[PDB]
Nucleic acid binder design. Structure first.
Lengths: 147, 53, 49, 49, 121, 186, 125, 49, 104
RNA sequence: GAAAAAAUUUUUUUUUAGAAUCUUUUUAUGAGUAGAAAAUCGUGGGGUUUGUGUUGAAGCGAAAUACGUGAGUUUUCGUGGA
RNA sequence: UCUUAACCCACUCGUCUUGAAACACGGACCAAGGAGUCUAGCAAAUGUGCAAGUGUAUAUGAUUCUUUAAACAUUUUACGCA
RNA sequence: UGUAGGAGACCGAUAGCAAACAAGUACCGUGAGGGAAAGAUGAAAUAGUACUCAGGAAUGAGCAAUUAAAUAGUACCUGAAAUCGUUAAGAUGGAACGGAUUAAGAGAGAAAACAAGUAAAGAGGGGAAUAUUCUCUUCUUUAUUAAAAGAAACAUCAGUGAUU
């Protein structure tokens, strides 16, 4: 590290890259976030707009795991098949892939993107978006609610 | 300038250098654990120290 | 791509064997230099007073 | 580097996907980037080029 | 070395050499044994006693043979009869010889030394 | 004493050399510099510049984007001055012949399986030294993480950008200066 | 002035002496520019003390050349002669300071047999 | 004064480390590189021994 | 294949054991590789690059052929070696041989 | 890919480049504190390489037809004894 | 090279300072020591590896047990960030 | 933390524990307390400065004398700078030193700053031939023919001026 640092660039130059007029002082604005509102307000406004004051209720003891949900969009569901499985379904319209999204850790199925139309697929999941259910039904697939 | 972050999140003002501990014992502890487990495993007649949970 | 295998005396030669695919792998000398230095950093001790 | 025939052969097995079920690098083998030769002088000399 | 209990640091080894007990000093007052005797007992080396007979192999006095006068165990010098030296005033003392500069011919053999020779055999 | 601006200097900007220490990439810029200089082809000159360009600013291309771009081309030889990444969001059947700086292993395997060609830059130079009957492609910059962060102030009004924010928590940046109710909004 | 010799122009006689080292014992004699500081002599007040810059530099053809018309090559072992020999016309031998006399004699004799000038061969007798 | 911690544990990835070993073994394969490294090697029959 | 003569030069452009550059003024960089026939540092000079080479060298007062019942005791020679094993270059080899023959 | 000179058609002598941040060539340009950059140079240790050591090293003092724009490098003589 | 000469030029350096040769300040002299660092967390830049994944965390394993206080491996589908 | 180990990409005597040592000592403070400076002869002093002369005595000197070495002599390794002594050289009318430029003195040096080859007789090394015959080569020496190199001077050009 020490080979390449700023001291090696400035070593004989007296004011050290920190200004002959200025003369580098211990804490020339005071500590940390102190100048907010008071004299660094312009910095806070232009770079940190939401910062000051309160919003909303207090939950007091939230717990993350109650609301924990990983989501997946329908577009990427056929991608959860390996290559040979995807070829096999593409060939054969007699059978649908069943997809248990839980093994892949997902719990809500969302509606984004296109599908290769006229091919059934069974989606098993806890939760589905309104659009996702409609598109899965539209393409001839099935939605299965399961805990 | 200083548009990288609103805050320092560092909070070391409760005299951190007094409180501090530096840790690099890892492998040596593992060897001690291995030695202890080897000694136990051997000592019990070779009879498994594992137990079904 | 066969390489000759040798005996205990180097003038006597046994069965030729197809080389490992490793010897066709990319040579990243700069990567090796960075890895060596980083590994070395993990090996040497910082010194307190 | 001086290799035993055993070591040399084992090296091929290591990067060959043989034995040890699905374990090796969690179903992975072999650094194998597409950086490549033919040597540069051959490419320029090449009659079409 | 291959043992990882015993130190290989220079500092400690030197310290042990310098602050050595008398028995330790006696141990390192060993000399190589003369070639036929070496063959006879298959013994490389013996600790010298005061009345032994050495040949000198190193220093300006190499190739002088003779009886050992006195041993100084402490500062690692044996004294041999024909390595005399006069002092600055002309008075005669013996030149001190490091024990690794000499090869031992005639050992004086006591009961204890004989028991050691028996141990070596 | 002459009056010239910038003391008469022409001062070029951006990369002045490739600063990578990679032997293969140094060999490749030697090759493409030679190919550009001798041919005087615009295709080669672009390749040389894109090879010199920062590795971070060299983009990934999506396989979906590559296929979407190549759709009107019956000639199959795609050239990409970046990395080609795979797609897990569609069937991705139709093969191509693609030269790229780097291939993901999954993408390469799919392209090879489909009956395509994953082509080296040395192979491209050898076969197609003029670049004729080919298609040069770029992956998109598409507002990368730094680009999302920067661009003439996120806290200014009438601007869309990401500030620093650690907004995984609940009580994070939403009030005074970002809110029409509390003082004012951006 | 300057020192022309054949097609070899050397443009600097009188190597520079560090400012104020004439007045003060503490200041080292070997040159230093007062670049790190304001100093009123970098401000080019005429005749105060001349100071160096790149322009005095040697010509590209003669760049490191000796008046021998031969580049100096320093030799500390005999085997280092062997690549050097085919360019003996354009290079001259310097034998390193730290060479023991038996070896030095051997190197001198061998170098003379190899037919290249050795500039310190007339020393360490 | 030196505090005890001066970055004793650095990372460098599993993939990077693996790459360095494979590429170094590949490099060890190469005859020119063996000579270039300073090994005396003229009378060895060929470098992959 | 992975190896390339050019790639070796790119690898050894700065770094090789037998590259030697003078400290007392930088002008002159030599290549001490005995597989070379010309001993300045360039990849054209270098035996690392040279195609599948076989070479007549110089060691300890002897003409040497070095190589890429038993017979034992228990300049014209150089000319003979060149005419046998062969490959501008011939003239350069002749020049080296002339120097080596005239005085060792 | 052959140029010249010495000899007495034939012998001898000098030279005889390919390092792509490299080499040849052209033209323009050169102020500078605060300040930013790049190229270097030197010191302690380590890995690596191939060397220097008691026919005297490091160090030191006096110097050098010495080298480099320069920082400095190298060397000679004297001391010196690892 | 050193040495005086003689001609021409040449005001105490450092300093804060609009402005220092100042009747502004520090400096009797010489030697050695003597000042932008380290950690944490963040950012952009560039290099480097992999990619819709990535990072083996803690930890287990070994004919790992001068070096070895790291190097090696990941069960004959945790967590960070995206 | 105490003791016992093993360590080190640590410090190397103004550093590093305050302490490499007869240091938590000397010494200082009414006292609570504060708290240093301070390593190195040589291989061997079981090699430690013998002896003589001149000296009141210190000491000095030696044609004397230890040691490889005493300008290694025990407040002993190397021994920088400030500072000061001897000798020599120069200088010197109310500063001093410097830059730029020549001069005259005093020193040093021959490697670019001249002499390839030939004959005579000394020293080496090789190669071939079948440990020794033939022969190829480099240094010293005597004298004996070349030459090249730079500086001059004028002429001749090209570029640039000034002149009438």
């Amino acid at each position: 590290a020490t080979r390449f640092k700023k001291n090696r660039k400035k070593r004989g130059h007296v004011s050290a890259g920190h200004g002959r007029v200025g003369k580098h002082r211990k804490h020339p604005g005071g500590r940390g976030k102190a100048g907010g509102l008071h004299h660094m307000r312009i910095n806070f406004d232009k770079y940190h707009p939401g910062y000051f004051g309160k919003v909303g209720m207090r939950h007091l003891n939230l717990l993350k795991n109650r609301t924990y949900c990983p989501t997946i969009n329908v577009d990427k569901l056929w991608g959860l098949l390996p290559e040979e499985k995807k070829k096999e379904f593409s060939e054969n319209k007699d059978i649908a892939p069943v997809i248990d999204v839980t093994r892949k850790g997902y719990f809500k199925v969302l509606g984004n993107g296109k599908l290769k139309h006229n091919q059934p697929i069974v989606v098993k999941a806890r939760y589905f978006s309104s659009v996702a259910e409609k598109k899965i039904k539209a393409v001839g697939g099935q939605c299965i609610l399961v805990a | 300038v200083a548009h990288n972050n609103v805050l320092p999140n560092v909070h070391l003002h409760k005299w951190w250098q007094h409180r501090v501990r530096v840790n690099f014992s890892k492998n040596i502890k593992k060897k001690k654990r291995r030695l202890l487990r080897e000694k136990r495993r051997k000592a019990n007649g070779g009879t498994p120290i594992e137990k079904l949970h | 791509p066969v390489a000759n295998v040798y005996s205990t005396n180097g003038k006597n030669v046994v069965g030729e064997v197809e080389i490992p695919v490793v010897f066709q792998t990319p040579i990243r000398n700069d990567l090796i230099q960075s890895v060596y230095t980083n590994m070395s950093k993990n090996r040497r001790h910082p010194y307190a007073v | 580097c001086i290799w035993s025939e055993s070591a040399f052969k084992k090296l091929d097995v290591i990067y060959g996907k043989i034995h040890e079920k699905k374990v090796t690098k969690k179903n992975y083998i072999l650094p194998k980037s597409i950086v490549h030769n033919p040597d540069i002088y051959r490419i320029i000399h090449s009659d079409k080029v | 070395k291959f043992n990882k209990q015993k130190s290989s640091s220079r500092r400690k080894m030197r310290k042990a050499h310098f602050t050595a007990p008398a028995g330790l000093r006696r141990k390192i007052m060993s000399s190589k044994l003369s070639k036929e005797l070496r063959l006879k007992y298959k013994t490389r080396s013996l600790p010298v006693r005061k009345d032994d007979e050495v040949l000198i192999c190193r220093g300006h006095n190499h190739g002088r043979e003779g009886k050992v006068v006195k041993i100084n165990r402490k500062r690692y010098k044996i004294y041999v009869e024909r390595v005399t030296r006069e002092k600055v005033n002309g008075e005669s003392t013996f030149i001190g010889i490091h024990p690794s500069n000499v090869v031992l011919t005639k050992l004086k053999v006591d009961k204890n030394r004989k028991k050691i020779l028996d141990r070596k055999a | 004493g002459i009056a010239l601006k910038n003391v008469g200097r022409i001062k070029k900007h951006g990369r002045k050399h490739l600063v990578s220490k990679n032997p293969y990439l140094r060999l490749l810029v030697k090759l493409y510099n030679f190919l550009a200089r001798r041919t005087n082809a615009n295709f080669n000159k672009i390749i040389a510049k894109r090879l010199i360009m920062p590795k971070r600013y060299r983009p990934p291309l999506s396989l979906s984007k590559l296929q979407y771009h190549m759709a009107n081309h019956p000639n199959d030889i795609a050239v990409v001055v970046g990395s080609i990444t795979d797609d897990k969001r569609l069937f991705s059947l139709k093969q191509l012949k693609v030269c790229a700086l780097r291939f993901t292993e999954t993408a390469r395997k799919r392209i090879e399986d489909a009956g395509g060609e994953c082509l080296t830059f040395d192979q491209l130079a050898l076969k197609y030294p003029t670049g004729k009957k080919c298609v040069l492609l770029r992956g998109p910059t598409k507002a990368r993480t730094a680009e999302k962060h920067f661009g003439k102030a996120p806290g200014k009004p009438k601007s869309k950008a990401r500030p620093y924010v650690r907004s995984k928590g609940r009580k994070f940046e939403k009030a005074r200066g970002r809110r029409k109710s509390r003082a004012y909004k951006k | 002035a300057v020192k022309k010799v054949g097609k070899i122009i050397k443009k600097r006689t009188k190597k520079f002496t560090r400012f104020q080292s004439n007045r003060f014992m503490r200041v080292k004699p070997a040159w230093r520019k007062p670049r790190g500081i304001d100093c009123r002599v970098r401000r080019r007040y005429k005749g105060t003390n001349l100071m160096p810059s790149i322009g005095y530099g040697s010509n590209k053809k003669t760049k490191f050349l000796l008046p021998n018309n031969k580049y100096k090559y320093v030799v500390k072992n005999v085997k280092e002669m062997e690549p050097l020999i085919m360019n003996h016309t354009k290079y001259c031998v310097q034998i390193a300071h730290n060479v023991s006399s038996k070896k030095r004699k051997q190197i001198i004799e061998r170098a003379k047999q190899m037919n290249v000038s050795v500039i310190n061969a007339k020393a360490r007798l | 004064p030196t505090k005890i911690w001066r970055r004793w544990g650095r990372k460098v990835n599993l993939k990077e480390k693996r790459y360095a070993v494979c590429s170094s073994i590949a490099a060890s394969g190469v005859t020119s590189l063996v000579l270039a490294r300073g090994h005396r090697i003229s009378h060895l029959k060929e470098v992959p021994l | 294949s992975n190896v390339s003569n050019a790639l070796v030069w790119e690898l050894t452009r700065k770094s090789n054991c037998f590259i030697k550059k003078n400290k007392a003024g930088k002008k002159g960089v030599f290549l001490c590789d005995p597989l070379n026939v010309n001993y300045k540092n360039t990849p054209s000079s270098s035996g690392l690059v040279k195609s599948n080479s076989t070479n007549v060298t110089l060691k300890d007062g002897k003409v040497v052929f070095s190589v890429k019942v038993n017979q034992h005791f228990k300049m014209k020679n150089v000319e003979k070696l060149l005419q046998q094993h062969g490959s501008k270059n011939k003239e350069k080899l002749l020049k080296k041989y002339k120097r080596l023959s005239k005085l060792y």
